[PDB]
Design a protein around this motif. Structure first.
Motif, PDB file in Angstrom:
ATOM      1  N   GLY A   2       0.787  -1.227   0.000  1.00  0.00           N
ATOM      2  CA  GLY A   2       0.000   0.000   0.000  1.00  0.00           C
ATOM      3  C   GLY A   2       0.823   1.283   0.000  1.00  0.00           C
ATOM      4  N   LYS A   3       0.220   2.346  -0.502  1.00  0.00           N
ATOM      5  CA  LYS A   3       0.909   3.601  -0.561  1.00  0.00           C
ATOM      6  C   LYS A   3      -0.062   4.758  -0.404  1.00  0.00           C
ATOM      7  N   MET A   4       0.346   5.736   0.395  1.00  0.00           N
ATOM      8  CA  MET A   4      -0.480   6.902   0.681  1.00  0.00           C
ATOM      9  C   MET A   4       0.357   8.137   0.490  1.00  0.00           C
ATOM     10  N   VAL A   5      -0.201   9.179  -0.127  1.00  0.00           N
ATOM     11  CA  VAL A   5       0.559  10.405  -0.396  1.00  0.00           C
ATOM     12  C   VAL A   5      -0.312  11.625  -0.166  1.00  0.00           C
ATOM     13  N   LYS A   6       0.179  12.592   0.611  1.00  0.00           N
ATOM     14  CA  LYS A   6      -0.500  13.892   0.716  1.00  0.00           C
ATOM     15  C   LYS A   6       0.479  15.057   0.643  1.00  0.00           C
ATOM     16  N   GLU A  91       2.481  -3.356  15.341  1.00  0.00           N
ATOM     17  CA  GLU A  91       1.338  -4.187  15.731  1.00  0.00           C
ATOM     18  C   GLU A  91       0.362  -4.400  14.576  1.00  0.00           C
ATOM     19  N   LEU A  92       0.386  -3.492  13.593  1.00  0.00           N
ATOM     20  CA  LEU A  92      -0.529  -3.524  12.451  1.00  0.00           C
ATOM     21  C   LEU A  92       0.123  -3.728  11.079  1.00  0.00           C
ATOM     22  N   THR A 114       4.809  10.730   2.139  1.00  0.00           N
ATOM     23  CA  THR A 114       4.539   9.450   1.486  1.00  0.00           C
ATOM     24  C   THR A 114       4.705   8.303   2.489  1.00  0.00           C
ATOM     25  N   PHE A 115       3.681   7.470   2.559  1.00  0.00           N
ATOM     26  CA  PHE A 115       3.756   6.208   3.302  1.00  0.00           C
ATOM     27  C   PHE A 115       3.784   5.110   2.256  1.00  0.00           C
ATOM     28  N   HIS A 116       4.789   4.233   2.343  1.00  0.00           N
ATOM     29  CA  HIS A 116       4.794   2.899   1.725  1.00  0.00           C
ATOM     30  C   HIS A 116       4.698   1.875   2.892  1.00  0.00           C
ATOM     31  N   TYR A 117       3.733   0.963   2.817  1.00  0.00           N
ATOM     32  CA  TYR A 117       3.484   0.061   3.913  1.00  0.00           C
ATOM     33  C   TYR A 117       2.984  -1.299   3.451  1.00  0.00           C
ATOM     34  N   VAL A 124      -6.574  -4.672   8.215  1.00  0.00           N
ATOM     35  CA  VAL A 124      -6.057  -3.513   8.919  1.00  0.00           C
ATOM     36  C   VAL A 124      -6.370  -2.283   8.063  1.00  0.00           C
ATOM     37  N   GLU A 125      -6.661  -1.169   8.733  1.00  0.00           N
ATOM     38  CA  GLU A 125      -7.074   0.075   8.093  1.00  0.00           C
ATOM     39  C   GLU A 125      -5.943   0.690   7.315  1.00  0.00           C
ATOM     40  N   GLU A 126      -6.303   1.571   6.389  1.00  0.00           N
ATOM     41  CA  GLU A 126      -5.324   2.465   5.807  1.00  0.00           C
ATOM     42  C   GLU A 126      -4.920   3.459   6.900  1.00  0.00           C
TER      43      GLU A 126
END
Length: 146
Positions: A2-6, A91-92, A114-117, A124-126
């Protein structure tokens, strides 16, 4: 995976902002005290790849910790990359990488997070709360300097 960017516009000086993350991270504790209670160096040296930093923070009033390795610094793109090795997020999430990037180019003046996870389990949630938190941190820092 997963990846999140703001991207947040900041009104303060981007270079100053980058240099906090790049050389003097220990300061975000003074600048966002509500959010970050501690930034301690455990191994290596501030400002250098491979250094091990420990964060004490509070989300939604809940006290948390993360131990991070600084995995990349890039002076061209004004970027720093932290990898979380220990603490509440693990934990997640199997893997969690935070990249902070400051665009100074032009009248453009912005911080991109940027999150790469990789999640441990499908349901598990974003990490939206964590992104909200990093934006609050950005804005505390901005206002602190403005």
């Amino acid at each position: 995976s997963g990846k999140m960017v703001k991207q947040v516009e900041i009104l303060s000086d981007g270079i100053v902002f980058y240099e906090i993350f790049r050389y003097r991270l220990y300061l975000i504790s003074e600048m966002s005290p509500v959010n970050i209670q501690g930034v301690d160096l455990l191994e290596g040296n501030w400002g250098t790849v491979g250094s091990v930093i420990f964060f004490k923070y509070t989300i939604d009033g809940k006290e948390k910790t993360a131990k991070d390795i600084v995995e990349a610094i890039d002076e061209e793109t004004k970027s720093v990359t932290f990898k979380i090795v220990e603490g509440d997020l693990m934990e997640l999430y199997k893997t969690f990488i935070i990249i902070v990037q400051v665009d100074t180019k032009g009248e453009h003046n912005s911080v991109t997070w940027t999150f790469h996870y990789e999640k441990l389990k499908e349901d598990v949630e974003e990490p939206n709360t964590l992104m909200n938190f990093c934006i609050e941190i950005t804005k505390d820092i901005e206002t602190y300097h403005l």
